[PDB]
Each structure stands twice: as C-alpha cells, then as structure tokens.
Design a protein around this ligand. Structure first.
Ligand SMILES: c1coc(CNc2ncnc3nc[nH]c23)c1
Length: 285
C-alpha cells in the first residue's frame, strides 16, 4: 500500500499550520492528533494550535474541530494519539482502562454519555497509542473494549500504535500482541534499528504474520520529517528510500510511511520532503 501518515499537533518545526492546511495537501492520508497527553484524568496539548479551555481546564478546540470535519470531507482519516513525552499518564489495571474506553468513546467518538467534548460535534476516526513511559498496563484491555463500543458508531474506526523499532516495544508491545490493531507506525529512527543502522523490518514482518491478533495489520516505515525532527535517523537519500521502499513494498503487510511530524515534513525541502515520499510510494507501488 501507499498511505502517508503524519503526526500533527506538537509543532516540531515551530512553523506548524492548522490541521486543515495539511489535509488540503495531496501529500498525506492519515493524521495523528498529538496528543491526549494526560489520562485517565483528561488533558490535551496541541502546542499553539488550541489555547481555549472549558472552565475545568480541559482544552476546547473549535478550530481543530472544524478542521477534523474538513479533513474528513476530503477523505482523510484523523485519529487522536494518546501519550507523548509528558509521561503524565498511567493505568493501574485493566478495569480502569476499560472504564476509560467508555470515557474516550463518549468524549471523542459517537458515545452519547454527555461529556465535555474538546472537538464539539467532530468525531475522530479512532485512536493511536503513542505510549512512551515503558508501562504497558491497560492498553490491550482499552483497545479491546473500544472495539466493542465502535459497533455503536456509524463509520469504520481505526486503532494504531507507535512503537520504536526495537522489538518488542517496552510501551506498546503488549498492546500489539494482545489487541486487534489496524496500523503500526514504527519509529525507525533514534535507535540502533534505523534504516541506515541495523534495519529490523523483517522482525516486524514476523510480528505481523505470526503474532499480531489482527493478521492483516499494516506496518508503516516511521521517519523524521527533517533534520531537526530527531536526534538521529533523518534520511536524504532518495537513494535508500527508493530501495528500502522497494525492499518492503512487496508484502501485503506494508501500509506505507509515517512521519514525525507534519510541521517538519511539509516545510523541509530538498520539493517538500512529504511530497518526495508520497511520490516514491505511488511510483514504487
Ligand atoms: C512513526 C512516525 O512517528 C511516530 C511517533 N513518533 C514520535 N512520537 C512522539 N514523540 C516523538 N518525538 C519524536 N518522535 C516522536 C511513529
């Protein structure tokens, strides 16, 4: 497959534009809103892109809400990503995480429980698990309970995770092994297993075909968008990309490329970096 996924929200480049600006590009297909960085007590952070709040401090983001709807009219998928570098999140047990599934459904999905909605009447297309605190409690139970609740909705919903390339991942490995997940946005950067390093794509294939509860899970080549975007692992060689893309694009388990983040990949020229990669995907396709 040929999808480009981009994280958006954390303003890695400094020059982050509105969510809809990136959706109005031909260059990306899936958008991970970064992040619900605090839970189970809810807290969002989208850098400069949302500053208003409900009275209780929870972000209230009318521009992002409108942009989710615009993005979706244009055929894009927009998931809410949980986690990030805050580490201001943790489940004590599965029961707590199951209760939290309902909370997410009613707050961000098509649940009818009357909760405060950061995105008003906009409805996300699902949830990404970008967990970074090396604590795995609750995520598989959360994902599983979400799958039951989604049947009440009126569109398809997606779950994804954002492991780093070392396998198994210390934060989302359990989730990946014990829940039905649609997409794995694997960070092949900041690690020994970078595409230039000891590229461990084959391990992730073995995972997809033999371990993943969803045998049809799609694996994404996760990359920095610019120099800049990451301490190590940024690629310029169109180069290995072409070959790498070629090497990995043969399997039905290949879903495409995932980028950290939109602000970086769209502004970094090299022609916007995201455009170079979109075109390598279709032409390598
Ligand atoms: C694939 C491409 O991007 C990801 C998520 N990466 C990511 N998440 C959270 N904080 C980060 N900081 C650098 N990269 C980060 C997976």
């Amino acid at each position: 497959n040929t999808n480009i996924a981009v994280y958006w929200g954390q303003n890695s480049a400094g020059t982050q534009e509105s969510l809809a600006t990136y959706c109005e590009s031909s260059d990306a297909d899936i958008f991970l809103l970064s992040f619900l960085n605090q839970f189970p007590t809810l807290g969002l952070n989208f850098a400069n892109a949302c500053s208003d709040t409900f009275s209780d401090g929870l972000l209230h983001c009318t521009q992002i809400a409108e942009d989710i709807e615009t993005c979706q009219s244009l055929g894009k998928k927009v998931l809410l990503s949980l986690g990030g570098a805050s580490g201001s999140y943790l489940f004590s047990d599965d029961s707590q995480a199951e209760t939290f599934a309902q909370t997410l459904w009613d707050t961000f999905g098509e649940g009818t429980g009357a909760s405060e909605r950061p995105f008003d009447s906009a409805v996300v297309d699902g949830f990404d698990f970008d967990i970074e605190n090396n604590n795995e409690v609750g995520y598989s139970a959360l994902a599983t309970k979400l799958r039951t609740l989604f049947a009440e909705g009126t569109k398809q919903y997606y779950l994804s995770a954002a492991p780093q390339c070392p396998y198994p991942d210390a934060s989302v490995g359990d989730l990946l092994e014990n829940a039905d997940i649609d997409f794995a946005f694997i960070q092949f950067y900041n690690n020994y297993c970078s595409v230039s390093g000891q590229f461990n794509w084959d391990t992730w294939l073995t995972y997809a075909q033999t371990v993943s509860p969803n045998k049809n899970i799609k694996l994404f080549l996760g990359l920095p968008g610019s120099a800049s975007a990451a301490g190590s692992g940024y690629i310029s060689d169109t180069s290995l990309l072409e070959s790498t893309i070629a090497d990995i694009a043969s399997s039905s388990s290949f879903g495409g490329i995932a980028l950290w983040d939109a602000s970086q990949a769209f502004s970094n020229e090299l022609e916007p970096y995201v455009e170079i990669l979109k075109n390598l995907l279709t032409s390598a396709s």
